[PDB]
Design a protein around this ligand. Structure first.
Ligand SMILES: [K+]
Ligand SMILES: [K+]
Ligand SMILES: [Mg+2]
Ligand SMILES: [Mg+2]
Ligand SMILES: [Mg+2]
Ligand SMILES: [Mg+2]
Ligand SMILES: [Mg+2]
Ligand SMILES: [Mg+2]
Ligand SMILES: [Mg+2]
Ligand SMILES: [Mg+2]
Ligand SMILES: [Mg+2]
Ligand SMILES: [Mg+2]
Ligand SMILES: [Mg+2]
Ligand SMILES: [Mg+2]
Ligand SMILES: [Mg+2]
Ligand code: NA
Lengths: 142, 88, 129, 92, 133
RNA sequence: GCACCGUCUAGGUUUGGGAGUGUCCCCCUGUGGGUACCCAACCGUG
RNA sequence: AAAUUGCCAACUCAGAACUGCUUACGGCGGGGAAUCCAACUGUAUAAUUAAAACAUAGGUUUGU
RNA sequence: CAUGGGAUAACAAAGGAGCAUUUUUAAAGGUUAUUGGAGAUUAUGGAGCUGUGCGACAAAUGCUUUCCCAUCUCGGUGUGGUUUAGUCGGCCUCUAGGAAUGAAGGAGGGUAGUUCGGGGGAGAACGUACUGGGGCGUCAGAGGUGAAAUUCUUAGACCGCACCAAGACGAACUACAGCGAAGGCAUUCUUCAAGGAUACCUUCCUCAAUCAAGAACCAAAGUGUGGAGAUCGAAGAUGAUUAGAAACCAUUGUAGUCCACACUGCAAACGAUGACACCCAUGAAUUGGGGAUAUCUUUUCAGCACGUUUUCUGUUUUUUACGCGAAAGCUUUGAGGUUACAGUCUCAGGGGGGAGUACG
């Protein structure tokens, strides 16, 4: 929306003031942890896991039930993604564009989008290197 | 270190054929001596062996191609056209 | 990107006072903003204000009596020794008889008259009159 | 692509083997659960692997990319013509 | 899975008997120090019966219809499994032995007799067709 | 004008008539064999 | 810390001291500032002309 | 340089599973004082080092757990609400795990309408028209202009019909409309990456704003190499018009115009208005996505589509409030909120010329 563009979208989710899980939610904390851990083992990113629980099990917030975030639960079980989830998606974005630009060399719009995606990667990767979620000497390669 | 500033493989010619003819021949020389991607075997191993003959170092497949590049733009257009006419 | 919450808050109050509004909503809130508001409220330039909790940077609703001609923040927070009070009063206050310069001292956030009486310097936050 | 996500998951947690010869070895045993073949594969080798898969009742997937693309989707720096996952590793 | 069953017809792809059709008698998917590879005991056609046409004597038909047989243990990588089968009875498989030389020769004679009877019965006719390549 | 020279077809659509039995051992499965035609009429043309 | 012990070959390249020159075999570019031609390498009047001539990459026409 | 204060800040560290109970007791084991100094020797114990028990405490997260197998009306309270109560359980292996500010009307990802759009790329087909050709007719002019002529024309022009070819282009619909970073982008179908907006009780946790140096894109003209060349058309030519006319007008006409690749990077590349962020009065609208609840169509991309009313987020706007301005004018789209002068960053200017010249 904002970074690398003129978009000024405000679309987002508004978390509630009342954090207590509803009285009708009878799922225990341990069973939720097994759910997220088995959903990650099924191959879902933390965002996909949360949407699955939200839409099917009635678990609005995993943190409000188990006291822990979904990524934190995966880290405790060692299931956390090696590369952070968003950096993974941007890298997948850049790869898919580059595959497209191999065949369409005249697609200058996708070339312009590619520069933004990579110039975004080199700040996200700088952040993860400074925060040590990524190894030092981690470089994005075209 | 870099051994020439502007002329690369054309440095073999000294000073004796002109900047622009050397420039025009440079691109085709660099293309014709480069390793080209092989759609078979997925390796960058296609080398030219005489004009229009390209042999892959990986799978040893020999292809009839362009004079100084493996595939000409006209060839890609013709391949797409023939595929589309086959699907019609 | 918002860089100074205090400057944003003081700008919003000054606009509301110029328009003659009875109440103004301030967002986001901060400890410095609330401390500044309490200083103005102490001297009677604003009425009661209410801090609304939203589990984030909160909001403040300030009731406005029409006594506040102008309030504003001074950026950057210039250092002010006890000998520099007269310089700042000359530069930014309308008169030597009224108006206040707000300081961040090690003794807390206070007006320049109080800071002078405590023999303490600090950084200038803003002004109101 | 769904197969790319499944392959990434198998690399993360499951067990797999790369190369045509090791894939054939896993097929001769009762160990292979899925065989992925690049569209680059030589036709006779692809026919042989498909025949082994049919005899062993093993699911066979034809990857949309070439061996370079399959190697990249596996997270590898080399090319693979045939992939054989021995343990799905909770994938599917 | 596990299609390398006894009785399954295979085609040998390596060695002197490359291209010759064989039958799996004993399959061995467990490796040992002596044979560190997946292997199988193959009963194979060393010499396919020749084509016989109408108008030849009984003697020459009998001569041309003889089946040659080899019995060796072959690495899994050196033969190609097929979907064709020759039925190997449990007793017949239990009789075939490659432990000793005399047992090996007796087993070869037994396999030759069984294959000759199979050819006479007109069964598994694909197995007795020579592969052309 | 009637004859004769002067006629046969893959395959496709489709009429009329059947005729061997899904069937025969294996030794459940699985395996190995064997059968699922003829004719007509229109396309079609080797 | 075999980061050690023994043997052994071929040539060189430096540095140092001393001591000399009668500058002393053969072999082995003189250099610089410009002008006119031809771009260049080539070829070419065997027996008076080697060039600025011819050729040459390039460039353009014509016929088909 | 010393010392006092700790509000505002700076530096450093971490990235949170990448982490960390005390006290009694006894017993078991394995180069110190003091013996009167000084020189050996010894052994004895302290004290620590482990492990075996023992007593008293805690503990920010329940082991009287968890998981894995197996057998099966009464009180209290208020002037009616509240826990009951009337209308399975017993065994067999392990077990360190739940204590972590919140998720910014800051950023980034996710999923969905297989959403929205002259957004981009690719491919195909379509449409008339201009031009040029013949086929079929016709016969004397046609074209062009203030008027003419250069020009074409019995050799059949012009005109008419149905056709072709080729290259452009995509009318009307087309709007104070949409998309795009800007330059720019209009036929249909099939495709390839995208992008935004919206929706979300999805994920994450300051990752941001703006920028010397540095990099990428960029209309038309121009340059190079290939192709194309229908139309129009710099240079040129000719006919007009003029005192002259190297122009405007007419007929032409080369380079160009179109495509591919590579250069060029100088526009009134304009909103003559840098980017990000906050407040900001009124009325009609408009584009896209969502909430809630009068009309039309309704045998399949259809539990549809549009449309009414209200609301909302995001976009391009319009008419008429402060305030500002030298004025023209701007005004939630600022040029307002500035001498009552301070949100952040950045670029540029300092009378006119010489001159965007000389030199490097
Ligand atoms: K000469
Ligand atoms: K946030
Ligand atoms: Mg930015
Ligand atoms: Mg010369
Ligand atoms: Mg020479
Ligand atoms: Mg005519
Ligand atoms: Mg149209
Ligand atoms: Mg141009
Ligand atoms: Mg050009
Ligand atoms: Mg040329
Ligand atoms: Mg013209
Ligand atoms: Mg300029
Ligand atoms: Mg400008
Ligand atoms: Mg829109
Ligand atoms: Mg307005
Ligand atoms: Na010459």
């Amino acid at each position: 929306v904002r970074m690398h563009g003129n978009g000024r979208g405000k679309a987002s989710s508004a978390l509630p003031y009342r954090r207590t899980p509803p009285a009708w939610l009878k799922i225990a904390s341990r069973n939720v942890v097994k759910m997220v851990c088995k959903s990650s083992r099924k191959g879902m990113m933390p965002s996909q896991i949360g949407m699955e629980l939200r839409d099917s099990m009635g678990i609005a917030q995993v943190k409000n039930v188990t006291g822990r975030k979904i990524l934190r639960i995966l880290k405790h079980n060692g299931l956390a993604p090696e590369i952070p989830e968003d950096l993974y998606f941007l890298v997948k974005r850049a790869t898919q564009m580059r595959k497209h630009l191999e065949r369409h060399t005249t697609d200058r719009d996708t070339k312009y989008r590619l520069i933004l995606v990579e110039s975004r990667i080199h700040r996200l990767a700088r952040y993860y290197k400074r925060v040590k979620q990524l190894p030092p000497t981690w470089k994005y390669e075209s | 270190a870099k051994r020439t500033v502007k002329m690369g493989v054309m440095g073999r010619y000294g000073t004796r054929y002109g900047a622009n003819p050397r420039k025009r021949a440079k691109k085709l020389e660099v293309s014709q001596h480069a390793k080209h991607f092989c759609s078979f075997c997925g390796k960058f191993a296609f080398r030219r062996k005489a004009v229009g003959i390209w042999r892959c170092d990986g799978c040893s497949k020999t292809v009839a191609g362009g004079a100084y590049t493996l595939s000409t733009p006209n060839n890609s257009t013709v391949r797409s056209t023939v595929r589309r006419l086959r699907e019609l | 990107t918002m860089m100074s919450v205090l400057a944003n808050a003081l700008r919003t109050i000054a606009s509301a006072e110029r328009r003659g509004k009875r109440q103004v909503l301030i967002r986001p809130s901060s400890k410095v903003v609330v401390k500044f508001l309490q200083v103005m409220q102490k001297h009677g330039y604003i009425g009661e204000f209410e801090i609304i909790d939203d589990h984030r940077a909160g909001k403040i609703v300030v009731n406005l009596n029409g006594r506040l001609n102008k309030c504003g923040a001074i950026c950057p927070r210039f250092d002010c020794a006890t000998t520099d009070y007269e310089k700042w009063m000359k530069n930014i206050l309308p008169s030597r008889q009224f108006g206040f310069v707000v300081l961040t001292t090690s003794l807390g956030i206070m007006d320049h008259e109080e800071a002078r009486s405590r023999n303490t310097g600090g950084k200038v936050l803003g002004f109101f009159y | 692509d769904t197969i790319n996500a499944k392959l990434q998951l198998v690399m993360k947690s499951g067990k797999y083997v790369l190369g045509t010869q090791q894939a054939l070895t896993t097929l001769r045993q009762g160990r292979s659960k899925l065989v992925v073949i690049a569209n680059n594969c030589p036709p006779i080798r692809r026919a042989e692997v498909e025949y082994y898969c049919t005899l062993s009742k093993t699911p066979i997937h034809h990857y949309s990319g070439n061996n370079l693309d399959l190697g990249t989707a596996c997270g590898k720096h080399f090319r693979t013509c045939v992939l054989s996952v021995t343990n799905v590793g909770d994938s599917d | 899975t596990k299609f390398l069953k006894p009785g399954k017809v295979v085609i040998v792809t390596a060695g002197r008997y490359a291209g010759h059709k064989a039958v799996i008698v004993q399959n061995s998917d467990v490796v040992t120090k002596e044979r560190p590879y997946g292997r199988a005991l193959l009963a194979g056609i060393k010499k396919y019966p020749k084509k016989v046409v109408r108008g030849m004597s009984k003697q020459t038909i009998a001569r041309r219809s003889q089946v040659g047989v080899f019995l060796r243990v072959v690495n899994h990588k050196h033969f190609l499994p097929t979907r064709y089968n020759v039925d190997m009875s449990k007793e017949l498989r239990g009789k075939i032995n490659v432990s000793d030389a005399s047992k090996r020769s007796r087993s070869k004679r037994l396999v030759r007799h069984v294959f000759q009877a199979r050819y006479n019965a007109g069964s598994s006719m694909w197995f007795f067709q020579r592969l052309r390549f």
